[PDB]
Paper text:
We then collected data in the absence of calcium, ensured by adding 10 mM ethylenediaminetetraacetic acid ([name]) to the nanodisc-reconstituted sample. In order to identify potentially asymmetric conformations, we initially processed the resulting dataset without imposing symmetry, and identified two classes. Although both contained non-conducting pores similar to the calcium-containing structure, one of these (sym, 2.4 Å, 58 % of assigned particles) exhibited five-fold symmetry and was further refined with imposed C5 symmetry. The NTD density, albeit weak, enabled assignment of 87 % of NTD residues. Aside from the absence of ion-like densities in Sites 1, 2, 3, and 4, the sym calcium-free conformation was largely superimposable with the calcium-bound structure. The most notable difference in the absence of calcium was a local loss of definition in the density associated with loop F, indicating calcium may stabilize this region in a closed-pore state. Whereas no major changes were observed in the ECD-TMD regions in simulations with or without calcium, the NTD exhibited more flexibility, particularly upon calcium depletion. Similarly, NTD2 lobes deviated up to 7 Å with calcium, but up to 15 Å without calcium.
To date, the only pLGIC in which an NTD has been partially characterized is [name], derived from a symbiotic sulfate-reducing deltaproteobacterium related to Desulfofustis glycolicus. The [name] NTD accounts for roughly half the total receptor mass, and appears to accelerate activation and deactivation of the channel.
Numbering used by the authors:
A (entry chain C): 242 to 321
B (entry chain D): 322 to 637
C (entry chain E): 403 to 562
The structure:
């Protein structure tokens, strides 16, 4: 399946970060840090580059908080 | 633009099911869906004061929301509404840019003073649904028509009324305190089920008329008189049996006139039979045979001429 | 009688002080003066009375305005046909003395005569003629049989 676009926005839609394509271009990654007292985030994943009906493209999403080792987690999903 | 511009409203309506027609009070009831959309920058807000992208109002009419938020909104009403209107899924939601939309599912009864049942059961009617804005045209005006669904929906099973065609139009009509208000009209053209009436009424009536007609081949006039007397009673029995499908409107239709003519001819048959019986009693059988031939020749011609006259006077 | 249904009810005023009221209504009214003794050849009067709820020293009807036709035309036939109409302003006794204004609209109506005539009287005449004609016969058994059948035919038509 083709690589989709990734971006991070708050609950109001204000953009905060955008995805970066790695040199081994098989995945897209994102990073952000919290500055305000309370931050509510929304993660956007879309593949609407054009109007092609590709069909049943399926992707895996990995997300973590205070977990910079998401590249090689090892452990099964922990915490809440 | 130096001058202020009227706000543009997009409207659309769909009909789901016709649930009843009252032929004496001249009204019908319908179930459907209505949708409105307009753009107003005065309704815009900032996301950071609520942490949301959509602000919504539920279970409230447009007038109530306008009174609560103290801003002008495009209220509407049904022109020929009779009694209260049942509403479901009523919601108004607004985007930060100022785009607003209205949704409603309704069940309403509408007056139809234009009904005409003169040609019953071959009559064709018009079902008109009118939506009028309750504001002058200088504030809000209908601009576009949106087709969110099929205007006329299909349902399983047969229907008493069959829709042949439909149309939608936007016009302007005079408004109270002068000025003008927009009107959105949906018109449905309908007709009845002809096979039901034909097979249920006309074939048995034709058979009864044929029974009354065929008895003139007999030369024993007592049997002819007895069969005519019985067939008149059979005709009356069939007439009241089908009286259930005979609407009481206070004025005559085609079916009533046809029944009256058939009854009159059936009674004249008995009268002629009595006259022929007396003539045969006196000894003038030749005149009776001549009368038999005359009746056999004349009766279908009279029926055909009456049918032609009715067609000329009611269908052209 | 009962509640009244109203549509497009609005009151609007101008800075000079000129105000007007508008309403579209559907109402049911009692008519104790009905008389159906001469049915179906009876004639009836439909009276609509509007009474002010204030004494005549505060408000009073002064003029009659014909903004539209008093009786409107509609497509198709009607059970009741209006022959004439009239409008008048009068004064009637009011509670706690004084007087209140009244505006009355009267409609004269009649039924559709051709319907009743053609649907009832001609078949009845034919049945009576059938009962009358049998006396020319000199075979009295046939006359008795036809009379017995015609009585049942008459009963059948009557309940029909």
């Amino acid at each position: 399946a083709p690589l989709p676009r990734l971006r991070l926005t708050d609950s109001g839609g204000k953009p905060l970060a955008f995805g970066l394509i790695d040199q081994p271009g098989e995945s897209v990654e994102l990073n952000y840090t919290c500055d305000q007292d309370i931050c509510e985030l929304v993660v956007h994943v879309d593949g609407t580059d054009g109007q092609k009906d590709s069909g049943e493209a399926v992707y895996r999403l990995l997300v973590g908080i205070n977990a910079p080792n998401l590249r090689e987690s090892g452990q099964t999903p922990v915490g809440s | 633009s130096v001058f202020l511009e009227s706000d543009l409203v997009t409207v659309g309506l769909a009909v789901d099911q016709i649930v009843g027609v009252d032929q004496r009070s001249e009204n019908f009831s319908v179930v459907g869906t209505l949708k409105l959309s307009w753009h107003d920058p005065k309704l815009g807000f900032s996301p950071d004061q609520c942490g949301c992208t959509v602000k919504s109002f539920e279970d409230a009419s447009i007038r109530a929301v306008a009174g609560e938020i103290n801003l002008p909104l495009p209220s509407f009403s049904f022109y020929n509404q009779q009694g209260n209107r049942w509403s479901q899924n009523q919601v108004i939601f607004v985007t930060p840019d100022g785009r607003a939309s209205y949704f409603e599912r309704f069940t309403v009864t509408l007056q139809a003073p234009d009904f005409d049942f003169l040609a019953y059961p071959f009559d064709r009617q018009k079902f008109s649904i009118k939506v009028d804005l309750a504001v002058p045209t200088n504030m809000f005006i209908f601009n576009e028509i949106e087709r969110f669904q099929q205007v006329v929906g299909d349902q399983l099973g047969e229907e008493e009324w069959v829709v042949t065609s439909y149309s939608q139009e936007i016009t302007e009509v005079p408004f109270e305190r002068g000025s003008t208000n927009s009107r959105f009209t949906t018109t449905l053209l309908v007709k009845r089920n002809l096979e039901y009436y034909i097979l249920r009424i006309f074939v048995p009536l034709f058979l009864i008329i044929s029974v009354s007609w065929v008895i003139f081949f007999l030369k024993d006039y007592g049997r002819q008189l007895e069969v005519a007397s019985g067939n008149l009673l059979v005709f009356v029995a069939f007439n009241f049996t089908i009286s259930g499908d005979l609407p009481r409107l206070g004025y005559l239709t085609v079916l009533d006139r046809f029944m009256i003519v058939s009854f009159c001819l059936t009674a004249i048959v008995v009268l002629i039979s009595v006259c022929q019986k007396r003539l045969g009693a006196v000894g003038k059988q030749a005149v009776a045979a001549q009368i038999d031939t005359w009746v056999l020749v004349i009766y279908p011609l009279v029926y055909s001429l009456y049918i032609i006259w009715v067609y000329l006077r009611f269908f052209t």
